[PDB]
């Protein structure tokens, strides 16, 4: 009976998750704490990760835009200071990947990191920080100088502190960069950002997908040919897992439908539908509920864990596909994804979502939000659905 498609539900859910993190995530000494137990207690106060530092700026910016709460605007400023004063290396323009007690632990320059930095700065401009328009331009320049490969229409992934790149090429940083470029466009109105987002979408969801039977594989060589073996022996790596990730197929479907809002071009929706339909067919657990984490190129599930962000990205995609297409089967997907998530993944005692469950929907431990997780994916999905329903 709960109406998962109502603004009432979505706004309340976002506010429940904000109540988990706020104000306990704020470190008055600098930035945010990045490791939280189920009950909100901090289990590692000293280790910090660029992906959390940036995602928490998104959390609070999108919440301020929705609710107007002054404490949330203050937290956007606090979070951006940490990104600019502690992560950022003024000598190179790069950003520390991880810190331990404000000392740089890993200074590797990850494109994935810069996507999140671009997103945090775009959020800063959206909340009225006019200086963020320049920080966005500085980040664009840094990306063009080192990461962009015009010949392929895609960014390289990973360089050391002197900008020496590895040969690895990855869809995931490009996917988040498409997302960041859309945010940058929404914040600044600059056409270059929207157009770069479109180029990235075309190259990944059409050209690269063609090499893997119509779905987006994660890992590639330096010539952007598929690397079928990368991390086969470390398949649960956090950013570079092995196998097709249904969550990334649906996340792309969402990004293509956001592009379709701003760009008039025929190919976006049919590609979005192909990615979403195949991904959920292959990965939905019809017995226990929920989308599984990974499947191999033969279709066989290779990781049946149920992750928070997979469900979230998929319901956001389903809502966008439903509204654009008028196909009610997409709202049925939306409803079943939420029914699963509400029953198993959302913590009704403390708020926010569990990170993952095993295939039997059991908890592994009490580490709700380790470094990298801020419920940016779950609140972000709700903010996105709020763009297509009456509020
Ligand atoms: Cl997250």
UniProtKB/TrEMBL annotation:
It comes from the Bacteria. InterPro entries: 6-hairpin_glycosidase_sf, 6hp_glycosidase-like_sf, AGE/CE, AGE_dom. PANTHER family: N-ACYLGLUCOSAMINE-2-EPIMERASE. GO terms for biological process: carbohydrate metabolic process. Keywords: Isomerase. Belongs to the N-acylglucosamine 2-epimerase family. It comes from Xylella fastidiosa (strain M23). This is N-acylglucosamine 2-epimerase. CDD domains: AGE. GO terms for molecular function: isomerase activity. Pfam families: GlcNAc_2-epim.
């Amino acid at each position: 009976s709960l109406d998962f498609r109502s603004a009432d539900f979505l706004r309340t859910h976002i506010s429940d998750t904000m109540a988990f993190y706020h104000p306990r995530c704020i470190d008055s000494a600098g930035g945010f704490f990045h490791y939280f137990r189920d009950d909100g207690s901090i289990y590692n106060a000293t280790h910090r990760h660029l992906v959390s530092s940036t995602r928490f700026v998104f959390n609070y910016a999108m919440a301020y835009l929705q609710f107007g709460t002054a404490e949330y605007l203050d937290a956007v400023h606090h979070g951006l200071s940490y990104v600019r004063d502690v992560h950022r290396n003024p000598a190179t323009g790069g950003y520390a990947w991880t810190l331990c007690d404000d000392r740089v632990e890993d200074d590797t320059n990850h494109c994935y990191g810069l996507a999140f930095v671009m997103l945090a700065y775009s959020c800063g401009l959206k909340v009225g920080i006019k200086q963020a328009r320049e920080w966005m331009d500085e980040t664009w320049c840094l990306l063009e100088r080192h990461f962009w490969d015009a010949e392929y229409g895609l960014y390289k992934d990973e360089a050391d502190a002197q900008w020496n790149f590895t040969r690895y090429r990855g869809q995931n940083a490009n996917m988040h960069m498409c997302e960041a470029m859309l945010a940058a466009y929404e914040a600044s109105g600059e056409q270059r950002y929207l157009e770069r987002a479109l180029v990235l979408a075309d190259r990944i969801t059409r050209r690269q997908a063609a090499k893997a039977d119509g779905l987006v594989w994660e890992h590639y060589d330096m010539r952007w040919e598929v690397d079928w073996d990368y991390n086969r022996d470390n398949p649960k790596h956090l950013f570079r897992p092995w196998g097709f990730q249904p969550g990334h197929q649906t996340e792309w479907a969402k990004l293509l439908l956001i592009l379709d809002r701003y760009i008039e071009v025929e190919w976006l929706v049919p590609v979005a539908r192909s990615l979403f339909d195949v991904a959920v067919a292959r990965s939905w657990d019809a017995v226990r509920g929920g989308l599984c984490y990974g499947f191999a190129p033969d279709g066989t599930i290779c990781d049946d864990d149920k992750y928070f962000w997979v469900q979230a990205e998929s319901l956001a995609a389903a809502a966008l596909l439903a509204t654009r297409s008028g196909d009610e089967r997409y709202w049925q997907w939306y409803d079943r994804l939420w029914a699963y998530a509400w029953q198993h993944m959302v913590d009704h005692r403390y708020g926010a979502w569990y990170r993952l469950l095993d295939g039997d929907n059991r908890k592994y431990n009490d580490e709700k939000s380790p470094a990298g997780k801020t419920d940016y994916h779950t609140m972000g999905a709700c903010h996105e659905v709020l763009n297509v329903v009456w509020t």
